């Protein structure tokens, strides 16, 4: 036994590379060298791999002897690491063999885990945890027995090892908890909390590996932790606010709190668990950093619990109504703002910035005028930290409060521009913060940027045209791209200089300018999206440059932002991508299957075997399908996912969808190749990748449908039918089963976009409508799994979350699209059940936005249903009539539009209400001041005049008295259709003639309206033509010149 397996001197290499490798120039039989501690550890590590590689070549004669040797060894070991290694070896033997093929290991576990000796219990639990971890599905039957064992063992607070290993066993078993096993876990939860409290001060690593169990138990699809939510939250708060504790454990606890809030936030809202949660969270956000040190985000040239506490606050804001959060947070926040300590201001600004996300509406309409809190105070605060927080808060404000913040541009822009001018060069971190804020504000301005365009262009060309650091050029390029997005067509005067600067950046092959290459490609794509025709001659040259950098250096951020460039260029180039379509379809599919994001981390014993068995026999092991001879869990010390490859997939999916939609003829040979991988991504564990894949399949369906319209061949329509039958079931299955809510909104939006484009092809298979309507009715009824079944238990019809209104609106937006696809005849029975929910949403006293959305959805569904609304007019008329009697512009406009279209498409059952309908339109015409609502009343009156049974016995004169159509050009088609429905045109001649004269210059007015007038002029040009002379004489001569022009 002269086995010198220990390091000796630094010449351990002289041992490893030379000895124990020269066997050729029988060791398995006596690999039981029990001489000195941790040499048994080496022996077990080597034996694990040896048996993994050659288990099936030992037959059965020595199998039992080896098993007995291992069991004897496991009952006499005294150390811990070697005991863990022997447990690993035992699990490896168990994993490759059958469940009942080792009838003594189970007996040992059952006997030891119920033994009255503490070392026996520790050795039993350690081995049990390792065995269960190795093959979790083996212990599927005995969940009740193993849960009972865990509940008995977790009460032993004296020994930390038993607690830690029982918690590891719970970690492994937590995902596979069934509904019938809930009471045992519910009883075990308090023991888990006690074990956590005991294990926190002993060691941080074990505390983290047991927080693993707690986190796994948080989300299990079964109601395990809900009855003890108060105790769990109290423990999390108690451990989270311990300032003397470590940062890693606090970060893990804050992630646990985030998951608690996300899964069930309403439960802690009904109880008085929210005020303590805020009182514990806020000091963490305003925590003073160590003296001398600075926060990670405030460095001159992820780690702290401050960011994770801010994230918890953000998640609380997302999953909670503002009316239940703002009153309980505004006092604390307001007291925080007016504080001497700068970090209190930083915490307040961060909390406000992340509150602007999930409470966008409440701040936007009611708390946006108090914008002085950020721009006028923190942006010029004496403390630099408060200035950085103010810049971040302004960026979040200008990115979340999108439509109502551009009104304050006149006062925000000059100070922001002065701030950018005040930042000196060489301060690229501060310049980056200011440029982030500037871009986020500029992107939404649109036409408002034109007054400030020359100043921005000069400021951003000062950096590029003069010597500056490479870090200060990508920021200028990004700001330039934002300015290009803002000024879509006003950027022509500066276009040549910007283009030549971008080309100069792209051409130069200097290795220190990679990020500005990425930004140049991105801004080239942004320019292609924004500016149109003048870039078409130069667009072809941009494809060569985009691929030229994509094949010189390999970078996930370079392959990305190039697919976006081609997606942008496909809009204007059109079918010109065919030569490059093959090259951009490959090198993109490879990015879609690239698994380089998940790189394993190996920190353990080094491999010294490096030997492969040589045999010449006839191997029969292939009969067992599930070969376990491969390298499974080779001392995996966790994984380190790179957050740059999933961000590559999320963008390449959208890029390929846009390319397929644009290039709809040349993409057919590659559509089948791309579709399979895009579908394969639907099971990705990434939120954004799943969202992008769901949004990309719908674009594939639309592109394939328009290709089928282009070439009406049998293979094209067969492929379209197959693609729809593969996508629509996936869309329906991912709505009422997928927990992530952000995916569900995207899926509903994609489904709405498919039903509008594909049309009747979607619903051709029988029974598809019956389940699509069921799904859309389940979303409105809050029965889906994404909404957590109305956050468990029940509700008393209270105010729901701010972000669930968007989900309900997306669900209800597909009803008009669904109606226009089923033809109306077959959609009536389903609309009968759909009606009560929409009527409830528009009940008096509810939200204004929901009221308007419900009324508009009813109007559009009337439009889609058409002649099948005869049985629904009776129910619909009271709702629209009551809604048209409010004091809101949008709501009343939608009500009038819906009432008019109901009159148009109501058929015979709607005719009996015509005198009553006319008796109410006259008072609304005069009293109303808004231009939109009077235009919609005009359109409703026109449509009502169209649906005349025989004739109209004046409505026509009063309607033609005023024609102020300004902001509703889409009603001009109905107005034009109104004319020529077939004598008193003398009185109403001047206004219609002047309307025609003014609309001659404008191309926005449909030509059909003008053509209608000529028919009635020519028809009446013979009978009673004497009135035309009087009409011409009455008109002013200046209008007479334009009148005589057309003849």
């Amino acid at each position: 036994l002269r086995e010198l397996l220990l390091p000796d001197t630094e010449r351990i290499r002289r041992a490893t590379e030379q000895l124990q490798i020269v066997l050729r120039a029988a060791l398995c039989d006596l690999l039981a060298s029990a001489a000195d501690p941790q040499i048994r550890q080496f022996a077990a590590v080597l034996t694990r791999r040896r048996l993994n590689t050659r288990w099936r070549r030992l037959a059965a004669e020595q199998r039992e002897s080896l098993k007995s040797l291992i069991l004897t060894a496991l009952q006499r070991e005294t150390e811990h690491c070697v005991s863990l290694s022997l447990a690993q070896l035992s699990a490896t033997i168990f994993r490759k063999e059958g469940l009942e093929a080792w009838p003594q290991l189970l007996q040992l576990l059952q006997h030891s885990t119920h033994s009255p000796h503490s070392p026996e219990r520790e050795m039993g639990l350690l081995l049990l945890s390792v065995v269960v971890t190795s093959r979790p599905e083996a212990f599927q039957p005995h969940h009740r027995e193993l849960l009972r064992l865990l509940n008995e063992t977790l009460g032993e607070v004296g020994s930390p090892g038993l607690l830690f290993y029982s918690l590891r066993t719970l970690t492994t078993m937590a995902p596979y908890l069934s509904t019938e096993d809930v009471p045992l876990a519910r009883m075990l939860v308090p023991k888990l909390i006690m074990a956590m409290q005991t294990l926190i001060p002993i060691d941080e690593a074990k505390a983290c590996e047991a927080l693993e169990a707690l986190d796994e138990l948080l989300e299990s699809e079964v109601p395990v932790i809900t009855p003890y939510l108060s105790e769990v939250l109290t423990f999390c708060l108690e451990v989270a606010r311990n300032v003397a504790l470590g940062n890693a454990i606090r970060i893990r606890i804050l992630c646990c709190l985030t998951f608690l809030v996300k899964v069930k936030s309403k439960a802690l809202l009904k109880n008085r668990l929210l005020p303590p949660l805020l009182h514990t969270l806020f000091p963490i956000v305003a925590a003073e950093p160590p003296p001398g040190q600075l926060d990670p985000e405030d460095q001159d040239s992820g780690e702290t619990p401050k960011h994770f506490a801010v994230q918890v606050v953000d998640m609380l804001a997302l999953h909670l109504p503002p009316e239940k959060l703002c009153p309980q947070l505004m006092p604390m926040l307001e007291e925080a703002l007016r504080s001497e300590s700068p970090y209190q201001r930083k915490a307040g600004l961060l909390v406000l910035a992340v509150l602007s996300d999930g409470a966008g509406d409440h701040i936007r309409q009611r708390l946006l005028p108090p914008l002085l809190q950020i721009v006028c105070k923190g942006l010029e605060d004496p403390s630099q930290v408060v200035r950085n927080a103010a810049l971040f808060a302004l960026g979040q404000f200008s990115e979340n409060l999108q439509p109502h913040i551009s009104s304050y541009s006149r006062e925000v822009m000059p100070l922001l521009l002065a701030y950018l001018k005040s930042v000196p060069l060489g301060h690229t971190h501060h310049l980056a913060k200011a440029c982030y804020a500037l871009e986020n504000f500029v992107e939404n301005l649109g036409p408002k940027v034109q007054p400030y365009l020359p100043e921005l262009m000069e400021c951003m060309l000062q950096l590029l045209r003069n010597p500056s650091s490479p870090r200060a050029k990508e920021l200028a390029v990004s700001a330039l791209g934002a300015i290009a997005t803002a000024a879509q067509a006003s950027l022509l005067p500066y276009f040549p200089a910007i283009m030549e600067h971008l080309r100069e950046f792209l051409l130069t092959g200097r290795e220190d300018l990679q990020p500005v290459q990425i930004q140049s490609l991105e801004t080239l794509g942004v320019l292609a999206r924004a500016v149109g025709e003048p870039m078409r001659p130069l667009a072809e040259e941009c494809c060569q440059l985009g691929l030229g950098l994509c094949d010189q250096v390999d970078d996930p951020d370079l392959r990305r932002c190039t697919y976006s460039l081609f997606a942008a260029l496909s809009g204007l180039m059109g079918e010109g991508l065919a030569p490059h379509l093959e090259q951009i379809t490959t090198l993109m599919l490879l990015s879609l299957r690239s698994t380089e994001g998940i790189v394993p981390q190996y920190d353990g014993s080094s491999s010294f075997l490096l030997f492969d068995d040589e045999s010449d026999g006839e191997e029969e092991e292939e009969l067992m399908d599930e070969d376990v001879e491969e390298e499974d869990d080779s001392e995996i010390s966790g994984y380190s996912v790179e957050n740059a490859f999933f961000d590559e997939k999320e963008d390449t999916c959208a890029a390929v969808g846009e390319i397929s939609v644009n290039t709809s003829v040349a993409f057919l040979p590659y559509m089948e190749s791309v579709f399979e991988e895009v579908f394969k991504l639907l099971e990705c564990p990434h939120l954004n990748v799943r969202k992008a894949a769901h949004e990309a399949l719908g674009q594939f369906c639309c592109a394939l449908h328009k290709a089928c319209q282009s070439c009406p061949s049998e293979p094209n329509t067969a492929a379209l039918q197959a693609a729809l039958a593969r996508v629509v079931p996936s869309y329906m299955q991912a709505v009422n089963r997928e927990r992530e809510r952000q995916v569900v909104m995207a899926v509903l939006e994609a489904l709405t976009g498919v039903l509008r484009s594909c049309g009747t092809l979607t619903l051709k298979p029988p029974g598809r409508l019956a389940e699509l309507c069921g799904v859309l009715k389940a979303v409105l009824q809050r029965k889906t799994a994404c909404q957590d079944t109305d956050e468990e238990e029940e509700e008393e019809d209270d105010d729901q979350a701010e972000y669930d209104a968007m989900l309900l609106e997306h669900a209800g937006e597909a009803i008009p699209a669904l109606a226009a696809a089923a033809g109306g005849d077959s959609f009536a029975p389903f609309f009968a059940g759909f009606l009560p929910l929409l009527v409830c949403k528009t009940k008096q006293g509810c939200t204004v936005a929901e009221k308007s959305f419900a009324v508009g959805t009813l109007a559009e569904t009337i439009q889609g249903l058409g002649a099948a609304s005869a049985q629904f007019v009776s129910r619909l008329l009271p709702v629209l009539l009551s809604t048209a009697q409010e004091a809101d512009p949008e709501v009343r406009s939608n009500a009038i539009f819906g009432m008019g279209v109901l009159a148009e498409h109501g058929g015979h059952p709607a005719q009996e209400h015509f005198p009553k309908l006319l008796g109410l339109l006259f008072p609304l015409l005069a009293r109303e001041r808004h231009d939109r609502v009077r235009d919609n009343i005009c359109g409703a009156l026109a449509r009502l005049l169209m649906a005349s049974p025989t004739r109209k016995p004046q409505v026509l004169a009063a309607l033609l008295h005023a024609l102020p159509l300004k902001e509703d050009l889409e009603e001009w088609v109905t107005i034009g259709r109104l004319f020529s429905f077939l004598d008193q045109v003398i009185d109403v001649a001047p206004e219609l003639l002047r309307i025609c004269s003014l609309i001659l210059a404008d191309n926005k007015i449909p030509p059909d309206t003008k053509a209608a007038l000529l028919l009635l002029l020519t028809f009446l040009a013979k009978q009673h033509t004497d009135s035309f002379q009087a009409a011409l004489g009455s008109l002013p001569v200046d209008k007479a010149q334009e009148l005589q022009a057309v003849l």
Partner: protein, 74 residues
């Protein structure tokens, strides 16, 4: 350069039931020869492209020289 379980799995997907012990070295040699040919063609394309780094396009172009083998005459 290919592990034995990978060879067994590849044979499994091909429908092979029983394998002799001498298959591993032979299939490693076959893979080495195939990759030598493909890398040769890819390097030829890369040199024709005046570049010092082989990309995916070069490999795709190189794969076209081996031709296509499909069952039937489709």
């Amino acid at each position: 350069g290919i592990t034995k379980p990978a060879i067994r799995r590849l044979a499994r997907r091909g429908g092979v039931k029983r394998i002799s012990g001498l298959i591993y070295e032979e299939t490693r040699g076959v893979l080495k020869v195939f990759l030598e040919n493909v890398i040769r063609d890819a390097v030829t394309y890369t040199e024709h492209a005046k570049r010092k780094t082989v990309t995916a396009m070069d490999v795709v172009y190189a794969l076209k020289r081996q031709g296509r083998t499909l069952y039937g005459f489709g």
